[PDB]
Amino acid sequence: SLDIQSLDIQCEELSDARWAELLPLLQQCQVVRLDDCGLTEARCKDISSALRVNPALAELNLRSNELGDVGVHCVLQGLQTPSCKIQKLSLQNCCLTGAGCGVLSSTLRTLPTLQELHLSDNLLGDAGLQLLCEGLLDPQCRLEKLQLEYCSLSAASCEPLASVLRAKPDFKELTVSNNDINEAGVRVLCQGLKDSPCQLEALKLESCGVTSDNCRDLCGIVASKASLRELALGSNKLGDVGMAELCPGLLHPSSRLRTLWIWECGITAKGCGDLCRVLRAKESLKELSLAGNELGDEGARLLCETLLEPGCQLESLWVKSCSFTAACCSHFSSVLAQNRFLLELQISNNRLEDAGVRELCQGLGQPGSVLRVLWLADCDVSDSSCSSLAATLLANHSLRELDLSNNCLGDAGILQLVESVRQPGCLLEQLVLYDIYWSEEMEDRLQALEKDKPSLRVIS
C-alpha cells in the first residue's frame, strides 16, 4: 500500500562520504529538501540521475545552493520524464538568471502535475520573466502558485504577468514582493486580476512601490474576488489616505479576507479609525499586522474599543513598534480579560514599562482568559514586573509561548520566573529570552529546568 519517505537537510554541507549514502534515498523519497548544503553543478548530475528513477517525487526543494543556469538545466532534465509527478518545486536563491528561464519555460510546458513554483531571490529580470511567461501561457501548464520575490522585476514584467493571470482561471497565489513595479506596474497587475476569472486566494505586493492611488485599484480586487483570503501590502507608502481608499472594499459583503498585512504603511491613528469600521463589521478577518505604524495610544485606544465589541473576531494582532506607552495597557488589559477570540498579541518594541506590564498582567491573570502567545520583547521591562509575570503564569492557563527578549530583566527577575515555570501547574511550552544577561548560576538553574521539564523550550 504505502511507502512514504522524506529527506530534509538544512544548513550543513554533506561531503562526498555523506553524499554517497544520501544518493539512494534521493531515488525513493516523495519529498526531498537539500537547503543550503553546498550543492554544486557537480552533484546536480547525481541528483538528476537519481531523480529520473524516482517514481514518487512530489516535492523538490534545492533552495540556497549555487546551482546557476547550467546546474538548474541539469536537474530539470531529470524531471522531463513520462513518470515524473512533481507538484512543488523551489529554486529559491539558486543563482538562476534570466538565461535560466528558457529551461524553466520548457519544463513548465511538459509538467502538468507541478502546481507550485518558488523562484524568489534569483536575478531573473524582466527579460527572464517574459521568457518564463511563454511556458506559463502554455495550455499544458497547470501552475497555480508562483513566488517571485527579489527577482529584479520592473513595471515591464506586469503586462506579461497580467496576461498569464487573465488566462489561467485556476491561479491561486501571486507573490511579487520586493520588486520595484511601482504605481504603473501595480495598476496593470490589478487590471489583469479584475479581468481574470481566477479565484486568486493570496496576493502579496510588499515593498513594491504601491501608492495611495493603487488603493482604489486594490479596493476593486478585494470587493470582487470573493476567493481572496490573504493580502500583504506591508512596506508601501499607502498612508491614511490609502487606508480610507481601501476600506470600502474590505467592508464589501462578499469579501471574506482573513489575513491583512499592512505593517510600515505609514498609517496613523486616523486610518486606524477607518480600519476599525472594518474590524467591527467583518467576523472573517482573523489576522492583522499593523507593526511599524505610528498609531500611538490613541490608535491602541480605538483598537481596544473595537476588540471589546461584537463582530470583531480577530485572532492575531501584531502591533510591534506602534508607539504605545504604558498608558494604553489598561485598555489592553480589558481585552485580555474579556475578549475571547484574540489568541496572539505582539506588542514588542513599545515602551510599556513595568507599569503597563503589571496591568496587562491583571487582565491576563483573570479566569477564562484565552491568550496563547504573547510577545513582550524590548518593552522596558525590569526585575520589577517579574513578580506579576510570575503570578500571571500560574493564574492564567492559556499562555503557551512567552517572549521577553531584550528586556533589562535580571538574575533577580529571572529567578522569579524559573519559580513559576517549574510548577507542573504551569503549562507554558516556550519561553524566549534572547539577549538578556544572567550569571553562571542562573544559567545553571535554567539548564536544570530544561532537564526536569522537557515539555518547555527555553530559547537562548
Partner: protein, 123 residues
C-alpha cells in the same frame, strides 16, 4: 565546546570572515546559526580574529563599566541584522547594517559570554 557560555556567544555573535555584509548575508547567517525559530529581532555579528574579542575580557583591549560589562578599547568590524517584516514568525527577513565600532560585552572567567545588543539598535 570551549566553555559553553563562551561558545554560545561565538555561535550567536561571531563570524570571522563575513563573505557578505548585506541583507542577503544576514538572511543566510541567521538561519545557519539557528536564530530563526522564532525570528530573533536583532543580532550583531563581530568579524575578525577571536583573540581580539577575548582580549576585551581583560585590559589589553577591554575596559570595565557596570555588571561585568566591558566596552572594548579597539573598534571592530560588525554587521547588525535587524528583523524587517510583518509577523514574528518565519520566514525571517533581515536588513543588514555594517559598521566599524567598539563593542560592549559581559565578561565571565575572562571570556565574553554576552553581547549588549542595545547599542546596536540605533547608531
Amino acid at each position: 565546546q570551549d566553555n559553553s557560555r563562551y561558545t554560545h556567544f561565538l555561535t550567536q555573535h561571531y563570524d570571522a570572515k563575513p563573505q557578505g555584509r548585506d541583507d542577503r548575508y544576514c538572511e543566510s547567517i541567521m538561519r545557519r546559526r539557528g536564530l530563526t525559530s522564532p525570528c530573533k529581532d536583532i543580532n550583531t555579528f563581530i568579524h575578525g580574529n577571536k583573540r581580539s574579542i577575548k582580549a576585551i575580557c581583560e585590559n589589553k583591549n577591554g575596559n570595565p563599566h557596570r555588571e561585568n560589562l566591558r566596552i572594548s578599547k579597539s573598534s571592530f568590524q560588525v554587521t547588525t541584522c535587524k528583523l524587517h517584516g510583518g509577523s514574528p514568525w518565519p520566514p525571517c527577513q533581515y536588513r543588514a547594517t555594517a559598521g566599524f565600532r567598539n563593542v560592549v560585552v559581559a565578561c565571565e572567567n575572562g571570556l565574553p559570554v554576552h553581547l549588549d545588543q542595545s547599542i546596536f539598535r540605533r547608531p
